[model samples]
Target chain A: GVVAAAEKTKQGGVLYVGSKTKEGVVHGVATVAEKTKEQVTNVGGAVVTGVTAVAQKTVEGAGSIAAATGFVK
Target chain B: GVVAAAEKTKQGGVLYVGSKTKEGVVHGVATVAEKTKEQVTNVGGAVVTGVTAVAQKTVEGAGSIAAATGFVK
Candidate 1:
């Protein structure tokens, strides 16, 4: 459904952008990006963050799939 | 306004549900929930995770506000 399509891309963008903006809140770009990597590692402990990271990747991949299918552009 | 309400609550539920489901993929419930907390702490490092945490909280809070105002129930 288009709704699911919009939901995934939009929400994935929201999380990615939100993470970047949060990065800028208190540090330099390189430092923030590095920190972001570190945080993704241990968040909610190994399991929670690990799971979310994979989900984020899957959602991003799905977004790419939608773009490829012309469901989004 | 109403769109925003639906977006917030629905997406918030998505993330929360996504996180929980991911947790169930490889571990016990209690352990997974605990891991989720830690992951939230370190996700993308302190700043990114910090910002997302606030945003998640805000989105949830807004959902509550919408419910209170009868915009959502």
Candidate 2:
């Protein structure tokens, strides 16, 4: 059932293994790792872009805040 | 504009935080860590597979090499 389901998920199906399925586990882990790296890279890029945009906006507003609060630059 | 842009980027947009964004940082780091672990695990699996494969091939070749060299088991 697991194999059938896995196969349905992909064109070639999947290889099911157990105690003797060392190669299967190895290949599966490699795939998972590649996907994980891609996801992390994506999130990291988003965070960097988000934070950079915020910092820039803050810098632009610095003068406004100083004027409103009667504070020196 | 950021919030709007972030929203347009995704269904819910994004959460804006400041120096008080400790929780955001923590969450982000946790995500990165999780992803990194997955990636490491994958690389480890691939390395293991490669080593095992090479070892097996070497083992299979050992007898042949010995025979060619006029050595006995």
Which model scores highest in TM-score?
A: 2
Listed in order, each prediction's TM-score against the native is 0.13, 0.14
Pairs with steric clashes in candidate 2: A7-A13, B7-B13
Clashes of each: 16, 2
Q: List the candidate 2 regions with Cα displacement exceeding 4 Å.
A: A1-40, A43-53, A57-73, B1-25, B32-73
- For DockQ, the strongest prediction is 1
Indicate the DockQ of the complex predicted as candidate 2: 0.02
What's the residue-level lDDT of B11 in candidate 1? 38
lDDT of 2 by residue, A1-73 (tens): 0010001121222322222222221121112232232221111011212111222111110010000111122
B1-73 per-residue lDDT for model 2 (tens digits): 0010111111233333322122121111222334332221101010112211211111110010000111122
RMSD of each: 19.7, 30.4
